[PDB]
Design a binder for these strands. Sequence first.
RNA 1: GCUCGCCGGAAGACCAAGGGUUCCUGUCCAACGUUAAUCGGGGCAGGGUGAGUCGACCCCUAAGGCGAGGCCGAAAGGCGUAGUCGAUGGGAAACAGGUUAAUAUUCCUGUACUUGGUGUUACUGCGAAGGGGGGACGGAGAAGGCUAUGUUGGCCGGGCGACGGUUGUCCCGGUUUAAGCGUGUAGGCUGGUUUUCCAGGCAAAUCCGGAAAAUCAAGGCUGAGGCGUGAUGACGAGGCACUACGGUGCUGAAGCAACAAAUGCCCUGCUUCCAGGAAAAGCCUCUAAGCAUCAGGUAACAUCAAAUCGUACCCCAAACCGACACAGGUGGUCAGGUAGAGAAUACCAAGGCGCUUGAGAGAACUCGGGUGAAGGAACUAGGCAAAAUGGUGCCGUAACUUCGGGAGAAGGCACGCUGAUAUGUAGGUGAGGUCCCUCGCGGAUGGAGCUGAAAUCAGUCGAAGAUACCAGCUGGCUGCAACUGUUUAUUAAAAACACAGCACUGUGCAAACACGAAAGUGGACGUAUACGGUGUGACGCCUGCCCGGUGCCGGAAGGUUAAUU
RNA 2: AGGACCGAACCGACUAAUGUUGAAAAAUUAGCGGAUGACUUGUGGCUGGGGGUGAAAGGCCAAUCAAACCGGGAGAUAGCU
Lengths: 46, 271, 93
Amino acid sequence: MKRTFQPSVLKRNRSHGFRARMATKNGRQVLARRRAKGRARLTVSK
Amino acid sequence: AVVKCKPTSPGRRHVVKVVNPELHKGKPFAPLLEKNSKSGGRNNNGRITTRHIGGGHKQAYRIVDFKRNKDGIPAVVERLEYDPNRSANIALVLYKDGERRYILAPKGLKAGDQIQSGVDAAIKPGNTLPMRNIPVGSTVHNVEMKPGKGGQLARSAGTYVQIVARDGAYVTLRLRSGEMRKVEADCRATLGEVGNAEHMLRVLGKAGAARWRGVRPTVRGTAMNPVDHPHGGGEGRNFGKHPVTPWGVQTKGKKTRSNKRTDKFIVRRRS
Amino acid sequence: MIREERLLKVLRAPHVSEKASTAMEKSNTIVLKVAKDATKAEIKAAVQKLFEVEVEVVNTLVVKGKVKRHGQRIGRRSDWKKAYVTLKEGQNL
RNA sequence: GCUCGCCGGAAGACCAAGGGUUCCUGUCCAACGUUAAUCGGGGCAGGGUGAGUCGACCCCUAAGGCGAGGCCGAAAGGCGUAGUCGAUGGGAAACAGGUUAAUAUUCCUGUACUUGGUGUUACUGCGAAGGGGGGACGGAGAAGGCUAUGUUGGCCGGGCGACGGUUGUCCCGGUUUAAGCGUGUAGGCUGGUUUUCCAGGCAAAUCCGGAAAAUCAAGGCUGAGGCGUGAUGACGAGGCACUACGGUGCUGAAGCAACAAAUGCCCUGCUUCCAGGAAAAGCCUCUAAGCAUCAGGUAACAUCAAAUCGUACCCCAAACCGACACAGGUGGUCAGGUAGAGAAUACCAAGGCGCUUGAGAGAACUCGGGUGAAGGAACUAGGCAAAAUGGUGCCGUAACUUCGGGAGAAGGCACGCUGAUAUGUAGGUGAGGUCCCUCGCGGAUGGAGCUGAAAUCAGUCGAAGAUACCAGCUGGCUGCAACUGUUUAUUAAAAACACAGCACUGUGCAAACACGAAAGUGGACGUAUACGGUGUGACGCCUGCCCGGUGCCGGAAGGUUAAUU
RNA sequence: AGGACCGAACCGACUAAUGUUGAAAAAUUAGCGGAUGACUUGUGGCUGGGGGUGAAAGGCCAAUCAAACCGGGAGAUAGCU
Ligand SMILES: [Mg+2]
Ligand SMILES: [Mg+2]
Ligand SMILES: [Mg+2]
Ligand SMILES: [Mg+2]
Ligand SMILES: [Mg+2]
Ligand SMILES: [Mg+2]
Ligand SMILES: [Mg+2]
Ligand SMILES: [Mg+2]
Ligand SMILES: [Mg+2]
Ligand SMILES: [Mg+2]
Ligand SMILES: [Mg+2]
Ligand SMILES: [Mg+2]
Ligand SMILES: [Mg+2]
Ligand SMILES: [Mg+2]
Ligand SMILES: [Mg+2]
Ligand SMILES: [Mg+2]
Ligand SMILES: [Mg+2]
Ligand SMILES: [Mg+2]
Ligand SMILES: [Mg+2]
Ligand SMILES: [Mg+2]
Ligand SMILES: [Mg+2]
Ligand SMILES: [Mg+2]
Ligand SMILES: [Mg+2]
Ligand SMILES: [Mg+2]
Ligand SMILES: [Mg+2]
Ligand SMILES: [Mg+2]
Ligand SMILES: [Mg+2]
Ligand SMILES: [Mg+2]
Ligand SMILES: [Mg+2]
Ligand SMILES: [Mg+2]
Ligand SMILES: [Mg+2]
Ligand SMILES: [Mg+2]
Ligand SMILES: [Mg+2]
Ligand SMILES: [Mg+2]
Ligand SMILES: [Mg+2]
Ligand SMILES: [Mg+2]
Ligand SMILES: [Mg+2]
Ligand SMILES: [Mg+2]
Ligand SMILES: [Mg+2]
Ligand SMILES: [Mg+2]
Ligand SMILES: [Mg+2]
Ligand SMILES: [Mg+2]
Ligand SMILES: [Mg+2]
Ligand SMILES: [Mg+2]
Ligand SMILES: [Mg+2]
Ligand SMILES: [Mg+2]
Ligand SMILES: [Mg+2]
Ligand SMILES: [Mg+2]
Ligand SMILES: [Mg+2]
Ligand SMILES: [Mg+2]
Ligand SMILES: [Mg+2]
């Protein structure tokens, strides 16, 4: 039947994209934690 | 006219329509139109603050002249119109200088009638003047609360106010609620009653009809679980509560007015 | 509009294939690898100065580089710009 | 390669979203593929996506987001003004044919169109972040005109039949042609022009709005399709040469009419209703600051420019969401023939497939079906499941009823084919010829040709004519809920929730109430015929007694009583 | 005209059989209800955890919601096994 993941790149980027993370203090904290962990991909990008 | 529908279907049997043939057919006067934004009863935090608001037909806003400040310049009523934003009808009025405005349509006002505002205006229906110049005992509508602020009282269909006294810089009004209220005599009021008194004679007849008006269903607190409303649960139909609001506040009887700042203007409260 | 230093860096390589050979024989069109950032105006001017031939029209596309999996890790070839440079009726080179 | 079978409002084709090379060619087969695999969406290599006019970007805004200053908040932050972003909506312009192994409205051929820059020439009041117009708007319904498309005839090419007949009232196939340009039709809307005056359109206006005269009855605006051109062309069965037998080159007949006909178009129309139906820019016009032999505006011709990114392939699925090559899920577009009311259904066309283990056998038992003597609910918790009914027309139809209903109540009759009325009727459509004319895509007359249901009478075949697929079972008593709706996604659809209606109660607007330490906001650009809370639940006939208790409302004399002093 | 009637698409989910190490972590087949409306659906937006939203079933809030998920206090505590 209809599953929970229904893709949309616009909604993906608006909700979880780099700029969305940079827009709030807590989102810049997500990027900082991920950078300290040494993550290859900080966000889903192009 | 108030019209009953034949029972050709169950949701039609109890319908009682208010059909007014005097009202303009079609579109309103475009220059006096603004866009209306539907809320769903949600505020700037996106939370429902007023329940049961949602859906219902799209409506354009008509700029209504509640101030009636265009003094000395006479005007003719061009047509009466339906306004989805209020119970009352509106009148498209043409001033001698070429300006057009919308006004609340008083009882009896028709196309061709001549209206005017100002301290000197004639005592006739549709005319606006400060209440210091309107005789005591007169029936008025679209009453200002502060001078020049605009009409705030007796705006709904069939409503009116009676100037029962004048003393000093103030008038005493018998509001439609039955309240005796003091307002300063320099506040304007329009002669007559608001028209469309047959409005209260309508019977929606079905659930869909309140829905077209943007009214969403009311769930009885007793129909809920304890966690949702103080009117809680029970095994079968149970009450045994002192009736309250969803927030645990005494509904039925408890007075909620708390305005020491405006107390001085209330002569006698409603009954 | 142009500069020699820029025109000298804009044309990268002739592109060889069956499509490129048939484009030359049938339509007098040369198929090239051009700088990724190269514009149709730059490719026209560069071909005219360096190849000394008259250009009719430049058509361009971006080729996406293919991905190859090496077990758990991926490799990616580079995206590049292809130019279909049509020369006027009088053919040279 | 020849057959056979399946789908065909899809199991075909095309978009979007999402994926990302899966696309095409060569080569390979370990692993992947529920089997073998020489094959593959698998491995490896190479190739492949070509735009001024298709989309994005771009200009414009919607909900909503962000937001200089600002307002507010221990800090973090919240809100918000000017603004600035944000499509799922508005805004310039391209079509037909050919081509590749794989792209094409992108390449090529043919024929076009849009908006800017520059130049020349003739004419000229130009100018905005502003004004006005416009853009620009709902539901339902009606029926006329069309086209897409089909059918038949004609026309042209081919045929003369594996077995009785087949030179004819015979068979098969084709009969296709765009945008653009010209014409301004069926039809929709609206009276037109000039002059003068003006408390309105933040300032101005020659524009809009308002006022008053004069004059003419025809003026304009919108508009499908047709017709012409485009087209001297393209496409076109087939013929003739070469073939690496995959194909390639050359050549090329007819290309018309009548009738039927959308759910597409005229139509953002018309009619009608109440629930009363975005914005902003492009665009047209008007002026302000300003420039006033300049610049700028209008037109013709010439010339230049139109960048950048996307474009392969899958797409109702083996490529997307489902761990799988998974009977699941996934928005939009197109709509051929016969029968049919139909987009149902059956058979087919174009097109796509036989679903990636097969071979035998013909036990019990399980699954899914077909038929069944006599009986006919005896079964069982219960007719669960089956079986049955099933179409159109006409006749006919009870209690009760809120007069709508109940009703398709129930029950009955007819039903194929052939001929006659009439070698094809009623009707629909409509050519020639004649005549008029403000000569047109015109009007009247005229009825050829075409198409064409239904009825009666007579006859005829079968057991059976709504023959298949498809397609109501009907009736009586009674509980509950008025009704249509809603609900426990995944054991409950109900008598539960909601509902129109009724009542109580709060609320005078900076409303009560609600989200918020606040600012701000919803209620509401509403105003007591309004808004909130609570209960009851259409309608009919009605709703009695009790204020001791608990809750609430009102009271101020006395008693008791906080900080404070 | 109608929250009108019959009936595809579309939306739903009343009954039964099958399936229950499924073809499927809720389906398939035969029947069933709504089908101009309180209808249905695409794209985007807003509401956030004692919070939302709820025609109210404690329903739903990314496959177990009478208090989501993740990380942390954390080696909570466990007179129990
Ligand atoms: Mg309950
Ligand atoms: Mg209490
Ligand atoms: Mg080109
Ligand atoms: Mg390109
Ligand atoms: Mg690959
Ligand atoms: Mg392939
Ligand atoms: Mg194998
Ligand atoms: Mg491969
Ligand atoms: Mg700031
Ligand atoms: Mg803000
Ligand atoms: Mg913008
Ligand atoms: Mg868009
Ligand atoms: Mg292709
Ligand atoms: Mg010029
Ligand atoms: Mg404007
Ligand atoms: Mg309308
Ligand atoms: Mg036709
Ligand atoms: Mg023979
Ligand atoms: Mg006409
Ligand atoms: Mg040929
Ligand atoms: Mg393609
Ligand atoms: Mg496709
Ligand atoms: Mg398979
Ligand atoms: Mg599948
Ligand atoms: Mg679907
Ligand atoms: Mg079918
Ligand atoms: Mg299989
Ligand atoms: Mg067997
Ligand atoms: Mg038997
Ligand atoms: Mg028998
Ligand atoms: Mg019997
Ligand atoms: Mg028995
Ligand atoms: Mg028994
Ligand atoms: Mg049964
Ligand atoms: Mg059966
Ligand atoms: Mg007979
Ligand atoms: Mg009983
Ligand atoms: Mg019910
Ligand atoms: Mg129901
Ligand atoms: Mg359930
Ligand atoms: Mg159920
Ligand atoms: Mg009740
Ligand atoms: Mg009582
Ligand atoms: Mg008291
Ligand atoms: Mg209905
Ligand atoms: Mg089913
Ligand atoms: Mg039924
Ligand atoms: Mg139905
Ligand atoms: Mg959504
Ligand atoms: Mg601790
Ligand atoms: Mg532990």
